[PDB]
Enzyme design. Structure first.
Site, PDB file in Angstrom:
ATOM      1  N   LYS C 321       0.822  -1.206   0.000  1.00  0.00           N
ATOM      2  CA  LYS C 321       0.000   0.000   0.000  1.00  0.00           C
ATOM      3  C   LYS C 321       0.858   1.260   0.000  1.00  0.00           C
ATOM      4  O   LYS C 321       0.598   2.201  -0.761  1.00  0.00           O
ATOM      5  CB  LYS C 321      -0.936  -0.016   1.207  1.00  0.00           C
ATOM      6  CG  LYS C 321      -1.707   1.271   1.425  1.00  0.00           C
ATOM      7  CD  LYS C 321      -2.414   1.254   2.769  1.00  0.00           C
ATOM      8  CE  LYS C 321      -1.426   1.006   3.899  1.00  0.00           C
ATOM      9  NZ  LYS C 321      -2.068   1.099   5.241  1.00  0.00           N
ATOM     10  N   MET C 408      -8.763  18.174  10.505  1.00  0.00           N
ATOM     11  CA  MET C 408      -8.551  18.735   9.176  1.00  0.00           C
ATOM     12  C   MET C 408      -9.726  19.583   8.707  1.00  0.00           C
ATOM     13  O   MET C 408      -9.566  20.383   7.779  1.00  0.00           O
ATOM     14  CB  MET C 408      -8.280  17.617   8.168  1.00  0.00           C
ATOM     15  CG  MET C 408      -9.502  16.796   7.796  1.00  0.00           C
ATOM     16  SD  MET C 408      -9.108  15.470   6.638  1.00  0.00           S
ATOM     17  CE  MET C 408      -8.172  14.367   7.695  1.00  0.00           C
ATOM     18  N   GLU C 423      -5.480   8.680   3.984  1.00  0.00           N
ATOM     19  CA  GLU C 423      -5.604   7.233   4.113  1.00  0.00           C
ATOM     20  C   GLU C 423      -6.878   6.875   4.871  1.00  0.00           C
ATOM     21  O   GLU C 423      -6.906   5.900   5.631  1.00  0.00           O
ATOM     22  CB  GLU C 423      -4.375   6.649   4.817  1.00  0.00           C
ATOM     23  CG  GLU C 423      -4.121   5.171   4.575  1.00  0.00           C
ATOM     24  CD  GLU C 423      -2.989   4.638   5.432  1.00  0.00           C
ATOM     25  OE1 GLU C 423      -2.281   5.453   6.061  1.00  0.00           O
ATOM     26  OE2 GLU C 423      -2.811   3.403   5.482  1.00  0.00           O
ATOM     27  N   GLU C 432     -15.790   5.246   6.739  1.00  0.00           N
ATOM     28  CA  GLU C 432     -15.098   5.964   7.801  1.00  0.00           C
ATOM     29  C   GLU C 432     -15.137   7.473   7.586  1.00  0.00           C
ATOM     30  O   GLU C 432     -14.356   8.206   8.201  1.00  0.00           O
ATOM     31  CB  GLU C 432     -13.656   5.473   7.928  1.00  0.00           C
ATOM     32  CG  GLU C 432     -13.558   4.022   8.363  1.00  0.00           C
ATOM     33  CD  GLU C 432     -12.146   3.606   8.716  1.00  0.00           C
ATOM     34  OE1 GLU C 432     -11.212   4.401   8.480  1.00  0.00           O
ATOM     35  OE2 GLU C 432     -11.974   2.485   9.237  1.00  0.00           O
TER      36      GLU C 432
HETATM   37  C1  LIG Z   1      -5.952   2.450   6.535  1.00  0.00           C
HETATM   38  C2  LIG Z   1      -7.192   1.879   7.172  1.00  0.00           C
HETATM   39  C3  LIG Z   1      -7.358   0.512   7.285  1.00  0.00           C
HETATM   40  C4  LIG Z   1      -8.519   0.014   7.880  1.00  0.00           C
HETATM   41  N1  LIG Z   1      -8.674  -1.381   7.992  1.00  0.00           N
HETATM   42  C5  LIG Z   1      -9.627  -2.052   8.688  1.00  0.00           C
HETATM   43  O1  LIG Z   1     -10.496  -1.496   9.331  1.00  0.00           O
HETATM   44  C6  LIG Z   1      -9.607  -3.545   8.667  1.00  0.00           C
HETATM   45  O2  LIG Z   1     -10.045  -4.137   7.702  1.00  0.00           O
HETATM   46  N2  LIG Z   1      -9.113  -4.242   9.712  1.00  0.00           N
HETATM   47  C7  LIG Z   1      -9.096  -5.710   9.685  1.00  0.00           C
HETATM   48  C8  LIG Z   1      -7.644  -6.178   9.836  1.00  0.00           C
HETATM   49  C9  LIG Z   1      -6.859  -5.841   8.566  1.00  0.00           C
HETATM   50  N3  LIG Z   1      -7.033  -5.506  10.997  1.00  0.00           N
HETATM   51  C10 LIG Z   1      -6.382  -6.216  11.945  1.00  0.00           C
HETATM   52  O3  LIG Z   1      -5.882  -5.640  12.888  1.00  0.00           O
HETATM   53  C11 LIG Z   1      -6.262  -7.717  11.852  1.00  0.00           C
HETATM   54  C12 LIG Z   1      -4.912  -8.143  12.431  1.00  0.00           C
HETATM   55  C13 LIG Z   1      -7.381  -8.378  12.660  1.00  0.00           C
HETATM   56  C14 LIG Z   1      -7.125  -4.041  11.120  1.00  0.00           C
HETATM   57  C15 LIG Z   1      -8.572  -3.558  10.895  1.00  0.00           C
HETATM   58  C16 LIG Z   1      -9.436  -3.844  12.100  1.00  0.00           C
HETATM   59  C17 LIG Z   1      -8.866  -4.247  13.294  1.00  0.00           C
HETATM   60  C18 LIG Z   1      -9.666  -4.504  14.392  1.00  0.00           C
HETATM   61  C19 LIG Z   1     -11.041  -4.356  14.297  1.00  0.00           C
HETATM   62  F1  LIG Z   1     -11.824  -4.607  15.368  1.00  0.00           F
HETATM   63  C20 LIG Z   1     -11.611  -3.951  13.103  1.00  0.00           C
HETATM   64  C21 LIG Z   1     -10.809  -3.695  12.007  1.00  0.00           C
HETATM   65  C22 LIG Z   1      -9.461   0.928   8.337  1.00  0.00           C
HETATM   66  N4  LIG Z   1      -9.274   2.227   8.214  1.00  0.00           N
HETATM   67  C23 LIG Z   1      -8.185   2.724   7.654  1.00  0.00           C
HETATM   68  N5  LIG Z   1      -8.032   4.103   7.547  1.00  0.00           N
HETATM   69  C1  LIG Z   2      -4.423   6.072   9.111  1.00  0.00           C
HETATM   70  S1  LIG Z   2      -6.017   5.716   9.882  1.00  0.00           S
HETATM   71  C2  LIG Z   2      -6.833   7.313   9.614  1.00  0.00           C
HETATM   72  C3  LIG Z   2      -6.121   8.404  10.395  1.00  0.00           C
HETATM   73  O1  LIG Z   2      -6.687   9.692  10.129  1.00  0.00           O
HETATM   74  C4  LIG Z   2      -7.028  10.337  11.317  1.00  0.00           C
HETATM   75  N1  LIG Z   2      -8.163  11.198  11.078  1.00  0.00           N
HETATM   76  C5  LIG Z   2      -9.446  10.823  10.782  1.00  0.00           C
HETATM   77  N2  LIG Z   2     -10.251  11.830  10.617  1.00  0.00           N
HETATM   78  C6  LIG Z   2      -9.463  12.934  10.813  1.00  0.00           C
HETATM   79  C7  LIG Z   2      -9.723  14.317  10.777  1.00  0.00           C
HETATM   80  N3  LIG Z   2     -10.929  14.819  10.513  1.00  0.00           N
HETATM   81  N4  LIG Z   2      -8.705  15.153  11.019  1.00  0.00           N
HETATM   82  C8  LIG Z   2      -7.500  14.651  11.282  1.00  0.00           C
HETATM   83  N5  LIG Z   2      -7.137  13.382  11.343  1.00  0.00           N
HETATM   84  C9  LIG Z   2      -8.158  12.563  11.100  1.00  0.00           C
HETATM   85  C10 LIG Z   2      -7.295   9.206  12.310  1.00  0.00           C
HETATM   86  O2  LIG Z   2      -7.178   9.687  13.615  1.00  0.00           O
HETATM   87  C11 LIG Z   2      -6.219   8.192  11.904  1.00  0.00           C
HETATM   88  O3  LIG Z   2      -4.983   8.517  12.481  1.00  0.00           O
END
Ligand SMILES: Cc1cc(NC(=O)C(=O)N2C[C@@H](C)N(C(=O)C(C)C)C[C@@H]2c2ccc(F)cc2)cnc1N
Ligand SMILES: CSC[C@H]1O[C@@H](n2cnc3c(N)ncnc32)[C@H](O)[C@@H]1O
Ligand SMILES: Cc1cc(NC(=O)C(=O)N2C[C@@H](C)N(C(=O)C(C)C)C[C@@H]2c2ccc(F)cc2)cnc1N
Ligand SMILES: Cc1cc(NC(=O)C(=O)N2C[C@@H](C)N(C(=O)C(C)C)C[C@@H]2c2ccc(F)cc2)cnc1N
Ligand SMILES: CSC[C@H]1O[C@@H](n2cnc3c(N)ncnc32)[C@H](O)[C@@H]1O
Ligand SMILES: [Cl-]
Ligand SMILES: [Cl-]
Ligand SMILES: [Cl-]
Ligand SMILES: [Cl-]
Ligand SMILES: [Cl-]
Ligand SMILES: [Cl-]
Ligand SMILES: [Cl-]
Ligand SMILES: [Cl-]
Ligand SMILES: [Cl-]
Ligand SMILES: [Cl-]
Ligand SMILES: [Cl-]
Ligand SMILES: [Cl-]
Ligand SMILES: [Cl-]
Lengths: 303, 625, 625
Positions: C321, C408, C423, C432
């Protein structure tokens, strides 16, 4: 490497400036001692006369004559450091771990051979600086000791104040050496103490609410009071003038210069962080040097 | 081996400090996550805009190390209950910041001190933090056994220390916890880190902490004495306290600097290990019930339910009980058959509730020992155990034992019994309906027949245990009364609790019951004198039984049969804890009610204050007939 | 290594048989607890009064052996659904007896066959037994993949086997299970023991078992072929099926006698081990997500909540990624700054949501690779991660990176950005609230500024999985709607499921959004063609994103980025499963709703039958703004 949080600043008889600093954030939580024979060059490390890194951060220091440096450490230690014969090095004379928590304050008694230290372990200790031993340990307070201050001319008398709202006058010649003063009702917690240089029975104390009060030990009554600062008063320093000024320091990031009636005469907001220590120049009694956690060494001129 | 940790308020480098405390032999480190003297401003400029970083980076340790080896500490300048409004709000913000950073690191425990009586705003902030995101983290409340004000030296000339006995005042610190714990609504994530001083208080002050969730005990290096060789040791009272804490299996936290500087610092810790490796070795019962300490279980109902094979196995591996049964049968056989009739008189012996047949073998051994002839009936309603009984009978016993797979209250016996032998007693004697079963079986007993056991009596004792109360409270289930868990008894090896009064007899049953009007309902009123300040949470229940003459069994603590494994005590909880002051009397009422289908208990405290009647009409707990 | 068991219908001595099957290499033994030919009478005399014992004694094995090594089998003469009333009642009694004896032994699993369509009384008896005492025991339903009637030889002269294709008829055995499982109300203690024949059916018959709780696969020795050296092997179709079962991690049960008598009996088992130790080695993603297969988790909300350190750690250890992000930034820097301006033009690059700063280092590496000068802003609202950011900045980055600890959407930027890099994508792209965050941050982007990612699009696909449906159903909590678990999405590594139709795009967002009337609410209608008979239980959700031009990320199965770890798929359940026949179309509706405080999703199936609108007004699931 010098750390950002300037903790203490003291002038010497010949006009040299002793600085004590700590690193209260980052990977390493250590400290350092520095001596500048050019006070205007401080706090630049490259233009210092002497400097040493110590084990942990310093919480308070004081001169021991013209060569000694007494340090209260975060490690619970009292450390005596000594200068080189040519005053280029700062070597450790002793380092004793007798407190069980952070040593927050230290003060050298009038004779110059003994000292008194206070710590967060609620205990207050008396040190023989020659034998490197603790003469006596008192557990009189019920909370963290905030400040201790040796009397200017009596080697057995000293003030102490703690977070248990007690202001204790100490005369070690008594079976019960401590005596409680304090204002009438439970006032706000005492945070800073300072004996009067000319009157051996009068002192001043600043509380957590920003109030500075003038008290006489004989009449044990709040002779005067003044709401000087908007936050806790962390330091009180008298000037060497015949009729002295009072330098008050607070966590509101301001320095105040008051008269004998606690009336505000001068005020400086030059610091952008907490104001930790202030010292008057022996060569120029009108020059006041302040240090703070913004790594600034300010030299004010006061009328 | 002890689980120990090192408490520090000065950490120059986290990695070197952790390595040093690991080399010294500690299992974890209590350290500040922010520098203790690094007071921060959240409201007023310009100190509000202080350039970062605000503390150490989380990359300095692995996630496993943060999860397993680091216990956070609240900064000592955070005073959420200050009399000053500025300091109050700023400390609220700082406490939230430090707790959120601790949760961000995944720390297993976070330390917060209780130094004064008023900690209401601290409790508010902590309760708000707890109800923000599901977490398993623990909060250890550092509470001194003796308040520093009651511990200071008597050196203040115009403020002398009180020499007068203050019974409730000397317990004030417990209140400090009890109020705080009450303000946070008995959160299971909040425990006690009891700090011990050089001078120990009276025994009642120490006993006020019995039944409290003590996870850690804090030992300062200053409380340690020194022996002839210079090693740090403890006084005999401190050794008693250390043993009492080791029985609770708490974690010990060494705080302070090395005062015995000629010796290494691990010496302190070693002493604890010493004190642990010379602690009184537990008996067979304590080894057997080690993993079940304070473990709530529902009482077995062998009449309504069919017990599993391993439950019978647990019942069988109990040699003291069956030795007592065999001795009782031996004495009874010698009493009923004279020597000149030993060849002519064959006693009819019926085991009512034989299970897999330990009582059958006990009867056979008693017959061989008494040199008397017996005829055995083994009655069991559980057919799964009847399988084992009949395999035994075909392979070993023979025609001497007749296996009867039926209910003893419905069985049409071909003859009448000289002796009936039963094992239908529960932790509360009659709580498994032995009276009704032995009443239904009474008709095929001879006019001079004997029942073993011949008598049994239940016993009750009020106890104090916030831990067991919190466990019962956690036993809340869906699709039922949100408080039904408080209206039912639990079989449990009582461990962390405080007996408030001597046990007293409750219900008594005898067999055979010649009384024409048989009525097993009971109503009992008990007055328990209490000589301590405490909090009533429930009643422990035990039983005694006379099998025959002087042959008895008992789980009552004063007269417990040494080495008997078959029974744990029982616990009857109450919905609301009840404050009991020194000298007051706990008056409690107990009912044994029944209809034609089920039997149940009802109970209520009537003094020093009234509670609700628990389990009315058996709505929450019944015993099927 | 495989977990295998041996099935037997003849056990002379249980100890010797268990020792033999252990020497052969089996982990457990499926055996009858009563003799299979020992038919018992429960109503009519005199056979009702048959002298015991009725079966083997439980003392022949230890409790551990009963708990771990023995799987019970129902006697083959027990026909609870017989057309004869006598046989019906007698088989009810016998089935209750055998199930109660199995529970008395503490057996981990009990086998019951499904040989015909009507198993209603069997289901009634089993459901009554399940709701009698809390137990963890499992019930394996022995179901043949092909019914024996559809498997017999064509040797009956006046009853020929049908040669005509019957698409739904060939799936009849699945119905046998589906009805039974439905009659028992989807009990989690009831699973499938799929028996495999010599002749395999069509691929749709096999795929009808995708998503079903298959705990065991039964292999008869007769289905094994023989090679040149005489060792038993399997055909390539059987090998495909064995691989598909090994991916589900089921237990294999060898049944039948040794037909390859020249070789030892373990040979069969060895072949399985062979087939297991030469199965396709999993990729890095499958190794990373092994323990999380079909594990339901609540979706992260990094805007409303502050993520922990180890969550950021999981996000950071994903080199594919960040390589893609670095390549996108590299291409954009080369596009915006000509070669002659590489020393004069300094691009303003703002990382919005920097976390602990992996995107910052990616931007620095892209600047070094493109030979272009950049000025970095690292914006993060989580102060715990701001600690790590500022430690990084003081120790390594320097004045080139300005750390901004703010939201932000509220940050007053001192200048405008040439590039913004975020991200903020979830498993469902926008779940999200990346659109709202990048909209609030849009004002400090230049008129020609670039956003990385530049676009993202969510994808949905209807799936069939009774296992995941039962897990969601088990996610019922107290103090809330008893069905709220069905109205919320779950992040889950989908394993045992069946994709019913090709994924289709759902919601699409682009940045920057020049549109004057910005509206992130969405309403989408999707028509999924389904070409199999199946049961819809929910919708899997994936996403794609264009970071810059041809640089993309994707968890959509057809275009998944190889070796990316940061995202699991998402699952939207439905309250009631929906039967879908071959050729029908699943029409589903999806809403993205919002107010000023929260955003949520609503969904409903409208064809082939209508469901309830799930999560109305966000009552069960909301995403905080
Ligand atoms: C960049 C980014 C990535 C994600 N990725 C996800 O949410 C997701 O698919 N996950 C499943 C998995 C990949 N993971 C794990 O830790 C594994 C080891 C179990 C992390 C996370 C998760 C962890 C605990 C939870 F309870 C729920 C989800 C979300 N937001 C952003 N910005
Ligand atoms: C890398 S996972 C997404 C990241 O963005 C941050 N984030 C999400 N929404 C906002 C926002 N509105 N302003 C600043 N950081 C944010 C979260 O706290 C996390 O660190
Ligand atoms: C406890 C404490 C004290 C101070 N005070 C000072 O440093 C200070 O200003 N002085 C002390 C000293 C530096 N000094 C001398 O001339 C020495 C060399 C002989 C000048 C001046 C002074 C003031 C009044 C006098 F009566 C005499 C001297 C600051 N901080 C703390 N914590
Ligand atoms: C003769 C006789 C004895 C009893 N004894 C009890 O009930 C009792 O105290 N127990 C606690 C403990 C001793 N025990 C255990 O197995 C230990 C290993 C945990 C068995 C049993 C119990 C087991 C599981 C439960 F869920 C509840 C209770 C009852 N009736 C009769 N007739
Ligand atoms: C040894 S535990 C008590 C035993 O007595 C049996 N039991 C309890 N009540 C009866 C009864 N009414 N008739 C026969 N056996 C009984 C239980 O099934 C268990 O085996
Ligand atoms: Cl005061
Ligand atoms: Cl971490
Ligand atoms: Cl925590
Ligand atoms: Cl721990
Ligand atoms: Cl036995
Ligand atoms: Cl049976
Ligand atoms: Cl009564
Ligand atoms: Cl067993
Ligand atoms: Cl079972
Ligand atoms: Cl198994
Ligand atoms: Cl990082
Ligand atoms: Cl922070
Ligand atoms: Cl819309």
């Amino acid at each position: 490497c010098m750390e950002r949080q300037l903790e203490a600043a003291r002038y010497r008889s010949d006009g040299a400036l002793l600085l004590g600093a700590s690193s209260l954030s980052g990977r390493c939580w250590a400290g350092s001692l520095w001596l500048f024979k050019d006070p205007c060059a401080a706090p630049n490390e490259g233009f210092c006369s002497a400097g040493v890194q110590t084990e942990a951060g310093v919480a308070d220091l004081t001169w021991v004559g013209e060569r000694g440096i007494l340090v209260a450490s975060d490690s619970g230690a009292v450390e005596l450091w000594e200068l080189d014969e040519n005053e280029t090095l700062i070597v450790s004379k002793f380092c004793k771990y007798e407190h069980d928590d952070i040593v927050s304050t230290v003060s050298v008694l009038s004779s110059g051979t003994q000292a008194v230290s206070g710590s967060k372990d609620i205990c207050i200790k008396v040190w023989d600086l020659a034998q490197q031993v603790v003469l006596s340990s008192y557990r009189a307070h019920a909370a963290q000791v905030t400040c201790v201050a040796a009397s200017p001319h009596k080697d057995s008398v000293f003030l102490s104040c703690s977070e248990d709202n007690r202001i204790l006058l100490w005369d070690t010649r008594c079976p019960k050496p401590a005596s409680q003063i304090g204002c009438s009702a439970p006032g706000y917690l005492p945070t800073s103490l300072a004996w009067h240089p000319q009157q051996s029975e009068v002192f001043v104390f600043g509380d957590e609410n920003g109030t500075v009060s003038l008290v006489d030990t004989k009449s044990t009554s709040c002779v005067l009071s003044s709401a000087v600062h908007s936050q806790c008063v962390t330091g009180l320093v008298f000037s060497p003038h015949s009729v002295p000024f009072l330098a008050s320091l607070s966590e509101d990031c301001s320095l105040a210069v008051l008269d004998s009636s606690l009336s505000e005469l001068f005020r400086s907001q030059a610091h952008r962080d907490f104001v930790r220590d202030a010292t008057w120049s022996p060569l120029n009694h009108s020059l006041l040097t302040t240090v703070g956690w913004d790594h600034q060494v300010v030299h004010h001129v006061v009328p | 081996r002890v689980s120990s940790g090192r408490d520090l308020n000065c950490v120059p480098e986290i990695a070197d400090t952790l390595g040093a405390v690991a080399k010294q032999g500690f299992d974890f480190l209590c350290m500040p996550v922010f520098h203790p003297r690094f007071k921060r401003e959240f409201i007023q400029e310009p100190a509000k805009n202080r350039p970062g970083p605000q503390t150490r980076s989380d990359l300095l340790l692995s996630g496993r190390d943060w999860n397993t080896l680091i216990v956070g500490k609240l900064s000592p300048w955070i005073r959420p209950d200050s009399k000053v409004e500025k300091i109050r709000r700023n400390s609220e913000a700082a406490m939230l910041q430090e707790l959120n950073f601790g949760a961000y690191l995944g720390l297993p425990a976070f330390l917060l001190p209780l130094n004064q009586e008023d900690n209401t705003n601290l409790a508010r902030v902590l309760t708000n933090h707890i109800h923000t995101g599901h977490h398993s983290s623990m909060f250890w409340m550092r509470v001194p056994l003796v308040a520093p004000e009651d511990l200071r030296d008597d050196i203040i000339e115009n403020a002398p220390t009180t020499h007068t006995e203050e019974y409730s005042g000397e317990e004030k610190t417990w209140m400090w916890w009890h109020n705080f714990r009450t303000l946070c609504d008995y959160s299971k994530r909040i425990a006690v880190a009891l700090e011990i001083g050089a001078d120990l208080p009276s025994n009642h002050v120490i006993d006020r902490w019995l039944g409290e969730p003590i996870k850690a005990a804090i030992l300062p290096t200053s409380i340690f004495l020194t022996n002839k060789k210079g090693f740090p040791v403890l006084s005999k009272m401190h050794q008693r306290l250390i043993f009492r804490l080791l029985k609770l299996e708490v974690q010990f936290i060494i705080t302070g600097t090395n005062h015995h500087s000629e010796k290494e610092f691990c010496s302190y810790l070693q002493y604890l290990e010493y004190l642990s490796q010379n602690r009184p070795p537990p008996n067979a019962y304590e080894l057997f019930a080690k993993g079940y300490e304070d473990y709530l279980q529902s009482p077995l109902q062998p009449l309504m339910d069919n017990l599993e094979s391993q439950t019978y196995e647990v019942f069988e591996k109990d040699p003291i009980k069956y030795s007592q049964y065999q001795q009782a049968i031996y004495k009874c056989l010698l009493d009923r058959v004279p020597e000149e009739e030993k060849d002519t008189n064959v006693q009819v012996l019926m085991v009512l509730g034989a299970g897999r047949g330990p009582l059958v073998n006990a009867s056979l051994r008693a017959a061989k020992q008494a040199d008397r002839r017996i005829k055995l009936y083994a009655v069991e309603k559980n057919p799964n155990a009847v399988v084992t009984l009949e395999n035994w009978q075909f392979e070993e016993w023979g025609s001497q034992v007749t296996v009867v797979s039926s209910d003893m209250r419905e069985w049409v016996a071909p003859e009448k019994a000289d002796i009936i032998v039963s094992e239908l007693l529960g932790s509360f004697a009659d709580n498994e309906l032995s009276p009704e079963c032995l009443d239904g079986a009474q008709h095929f007993l001879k006019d001079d027949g004997v029942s073993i056991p011949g008598e049994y009596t239940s016993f009750l004792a009020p106890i104090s245990s916030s831990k067991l109360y919190n466990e019962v409270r956690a036993c809340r289930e869906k699709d039922r009364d949100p408080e039904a868990q408080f209206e039912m008894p639990y079989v449990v090896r009582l461990h962390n609790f405080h007996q408030l009064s001597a046990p007293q007899p409750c219900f008594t049953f005898s067999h055979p019951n010649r009384d024409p009007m048989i009525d097993n309902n009971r109503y009992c009123t008990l007055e328990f004198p209490v000589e301590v300040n405490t909090v009533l949470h429930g009643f422990a229940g035990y039983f005694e039984t006379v099998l025959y003459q002087d042959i008895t069994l008992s789980i009552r603590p004063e007269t417990h049969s040494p080495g008997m494994f078959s029974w744990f005590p029982i616990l009857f909880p109450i919905k609301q804890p009840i404050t009991v002051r020194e000298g007051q009397t706990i008056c409690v009422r107990f009912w044994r009610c029944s209809n034609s289908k089920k039997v149940w208990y009802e109970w209520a405290v009537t003094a020093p204050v009234c509670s609700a009647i628990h389990n009315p009409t058996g709505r929450s707990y019944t015993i099927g007939l």
